[PDB]
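Researcher: Can you fold this with FZM in place?
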Amino acid sequence: PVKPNYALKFTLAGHTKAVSSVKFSPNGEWLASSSADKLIKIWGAYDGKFEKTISGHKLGISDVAWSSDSNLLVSASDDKTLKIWDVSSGKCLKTLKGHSNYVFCCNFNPQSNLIVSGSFDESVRIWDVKTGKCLKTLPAHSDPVSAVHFNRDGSLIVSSSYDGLCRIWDTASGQCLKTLIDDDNPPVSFVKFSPNGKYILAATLDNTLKLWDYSKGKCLKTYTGHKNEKYCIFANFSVTGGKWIVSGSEDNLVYIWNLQTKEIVQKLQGHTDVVISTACHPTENIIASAALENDKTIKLWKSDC
Ligand SMILES: c1ccc(-c2cn3c(n2)CCC3)cc1
Ligand code: NA
């Protein structure tokens, strides 16, 4: 319909510091969370029930991502490394070493033989999952990298940075295929492809989300009304029910927008600190949200449409 009706079903407590990142497993069974407390935690996606803790990093974790078969995780940490984890055993399979500063963002490609990472050292790196060795280092940006993401077939990587740029990279060659600039260049705090791979969603620290057609290099939609001036907040395409845009906010709310009309259709209340991360369940109308230091909780919300 024209409004979803997301309601709080579960609150997940257990991280002892700010939560940084939540992600649903591709098979829809699990939620993974990462924290400034150096831990990864696994939860049931439908019941919110705590499953296990995965540890190893020497400093806080900024991001976590699932392999396509839901069996592996990769995490990105202030200790300048990434780790690949076997979720079932908790074993750390590889430690990816190479970045010279905080690793801030990470993702598998759809085939999940590659990982891409972004760092405070202003580079983007492409790693081989099986050997744990860095395949490419891209001179991507002139300020920290805030997000990295593979498109639907893994041929392209999008990156964003505080330098105000979104860039598109050819995975196989490492060549910069495109630089997106608008009328102005505020810091870009987040970026990711649309599910079909034709568009790019980009967040800027001027309280604004933009939908880009990247092939034509034009900005199509603009989403506002939330607060985002300081933090790198995840955003999502909601595609299981109504077609929405979902994002956290520095006023402690989860914002949901009609993707077409750009109107705010729902604002979720409940967190007590900045909502830094949101995720959308692959098959059900479920949203996971997570908050910073004064809150430390993850919330699971359910809608009928
Ligand atoms: C604290 C911790 C993590 C974060 C964060 C991590 N990533 C993003 N934001 C966007 C992409 C990855 C922001 C603040
Ligand atoms: Na953001």
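Model: Folded with FZM in place. The pocket of FZM (ligand 1) is lined by residues 20-21, 62-63, 104-105, 146-147, 190, 231-232, 234, 276 (CB under 6 Å).
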